[PDB]
Amino acid sequence: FTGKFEMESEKNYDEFMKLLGISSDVIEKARNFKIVTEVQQDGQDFTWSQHYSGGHTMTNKFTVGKESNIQTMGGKTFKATVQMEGGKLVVNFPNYHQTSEIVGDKLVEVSTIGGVTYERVSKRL
Ligand SMILES: Cc1cc2nc(N)[nH]c2cc1C
Structure with missing residues (x-):
């Protein structure tokens, strides 16, 4: 997991951000970040x-098996416990499933809410 990774691919960005309830204008503007x-x-x-x-940055510090509060880009927060399951970091909360994984020097991050799955793939630098 240790490294620096740049986002290169993502699946279902629009659907996921709409489901979070952010405006199409912010969805459109933020798309290019x-x-x-x-x-x-x-x-x-x-x-x-x-x-x-x-210039903006968001840092989260956590221990596997221990409880913590994860924060987002915008500033939303939520309680969780990160689990190591088969090389994936896994997080759970009310109606929210998130995984992070290294697949051949690529950080792959999946987030599911309802039947909407968002994937982010980031290349190692
Ligand atoms: C703030 C933000 C901007 C983004 N721009 C793209 N393409 N994906 C994103 C995800 C987040 C959380």
Whole structure:
């Protein structure tokens, strides 16, 4: 997991952001943002950073098996416990399933709400 990763592919961005309830204008404007993910793993402990276009950054620190509060780009927050399941980090909350995985030097991040699955693939730098 440790590294720096640049977003290159994503599935179902529009559907997912609509389901979150953000405006089409913000969906359209935000579409062009570059996203760089920085991860440092130290045993069970993770430091997880997302760097957006125009200087903004969001860092989340968590331990596998321990409870924590994860935050988003916009500033929304939610309680969770990150689990290691078969090389994936897995998170759960009310009507929200999220996974992160390294697949051949690529960070693949899947998020599902209802029947809408969002995927992000990011290339290692
Ligand atoms: C803030 C934000 C901007 C994005 N732009 C694209 N393409 N995907 C995104 C995801 C998030 C969370």
